[PDB]
Design a binder for this molecule. Structure first.
Ligand code: NA
Lengths: 300, 303
């Protein structure tokens, strides 16, 4: 079988806390003796329209920040800002701190989101960083400071902190150094993303998952050149496929015996003819939020 | 809308491995008991019609290797309850959450924590089908992985994984070892019976669409529950129970759309199709979101 699968969330749940400043409460990430959270926790409703964050932060002291782990208050003994993230030094180390790294992910890469409200984990689901640097998440009021991550052995790579919901209902946020993905800004203004494009390497990985799970109606005897495929892909607002991508699809190509450029010819026909009201792995649409690695991990 | 799993940490802290010989599968460690599939005691040559009572007689506490990672928990008692083995161990799990064992109905959803050799790999949501199978993602080594729901820090365990059917769907038991469906734990010929669409979940999804302003499918008509159920069965939809009508109450109150008026709306969609038009940007009616899942996702619920 083959489903969207998230990483087990326990190593991240043990790091979630609530951060309050005035009547603004959101989530923070507690690693060793530091709590990371969105810097807009320091804003009022009047502030959030056009915030001068360096000005707003200098008017704050440690005691303006209430950090709660379960129902235990941690004392803030220092604060700094790094881009759009606030770093609250607390007088207590988190013993549940996992091995971790901060990473900045690339468009097309996937991660798990632990959606949290008032410092309490609510749900876990798998996202991709879209080519326009938005994520198609599920986040409500209070979700800010929720994080996205990957787990490799025992090591959590944090790649996303949640900040914003655009008017189209997609989501924007930062890496854990506080830099936005995409052209977004942490002000209360309606922001549009760039045109979005489909993650071609991922669609191919999902078609290979489909073959592996016995869904083959879309295959054909034909091949294409990489350049000819890319011309059609670009026509349909799909990202270019690189030789690096062809290489990354190698294991799935080997497993199924279907050469990457033969699978490219199948996708070209799907784009040109459509699916004719047929489905692939239950989907009426071509799915582009599984990476090659996600398909191998799940299909071993 | 997304399939969202429950946070898995409270279950991660209960997963162990159970080995007989070179057969390793997952177990659930709650207080001083480990629960696992009873076929951990089988040999390959004897899985066509194993005599579990006579395979278990020949086993003693010292034939079971229970490990939390590489740490052995000594077995001090064993018993079989239906298709589950219960191994009493000499250590109470300090990570035991508040829990219950529940037997779910078809249509109910739950999170699966897929594990291999006691080590959690991934978490996903899924629905018990009306034919008592789940469309899981399970590889060899996943047996003993569990399914659960969380309500206010209480973990309700509802599924333990046992077997893959010929069509690639999965079957298992509750935590009392009773199979969902007509399945048996022997490597024999078993096929799941034809599946149907989970009507109560389609109606929850239509309510979700109305909550989000997508309401072109609402009509001037109503139906009786009996007339609806007879029509639904002609389209391979499950009939509604009184419990289904009751669990749609909150969404009916929120939208102001009576359950039997939504039924009359769905009946028109079944008779006429959607005609190009989508609902929540899907041409397909979704049947794996429960009324709870629609509320859970539209509201702030934490655990
Ligand atoms: Na229909």
């Amino acid at each position: 079988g083959f489903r969207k699968m998230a990483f087990p969330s326990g190593k991240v749940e043990g790091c979630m806390v609530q951060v309050t400043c005035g009547t603004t409460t959101l989530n923070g990430l507690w690693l060793d003796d530091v709590v990371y959270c969105p810097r807009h926790v320091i804003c009022t409703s009047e502030d959030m329209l056009n915030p001068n964050y360096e000005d707003l932060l200098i008017r704050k002291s440690n005691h303006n920040f209430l950090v709660q782990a379960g129902n235990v208050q941690l004392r803030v003994i220092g604060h700094s800002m790094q881009n759009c993230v606030l770093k609250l030094k607390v007088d207590t180390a988190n013993p549940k701190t996992p091995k971790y790294k901060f990473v900045r992910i690339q468009p097309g890469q996937t991660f798990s989101v632990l959606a949290c409200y008032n410092g309490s984990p609510s749900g876990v689901y798998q996202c991709a960083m879209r080519p326009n640097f938005t994520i198609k998440g599920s986040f409500l009021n209070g979700s800010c400071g929720s994080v996205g991550f990957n787990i490799d052995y025992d090591c959590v790579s944090f790649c996303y902190m949640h900040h914003m919901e655009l008017p189209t209902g997609v989501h924007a946020g930062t890496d854990l150094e506080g830099n936005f993905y995409g052209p977004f800004v942490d002000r209360q203004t309606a922001q549009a993303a760039g045109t979005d494009t489909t993650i071609t390497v991922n669609v191919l990985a999902w078609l290979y998952a489909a073959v592996i799970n016995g869904d083959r109606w879309f295959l054909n005897r034909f091949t294409t050149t990489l350049n000819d495929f890319n011309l059609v892909a670009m026509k349909y607002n799909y990202e270019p496929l690189t030789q690096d991508h062809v290489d990354i699809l190698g294991p799935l190509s080997a497993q199924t015996g279907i050469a990457v450029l033969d699978m490219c010819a199948s996708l070209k026909e799907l784009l040109q003819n459509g699916m004719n009201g047929r489905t692939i792995l239950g989907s009426a649409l071509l799915e582009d939020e599984f990476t090659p690695f996600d398909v191998v991990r799940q299909c071993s």
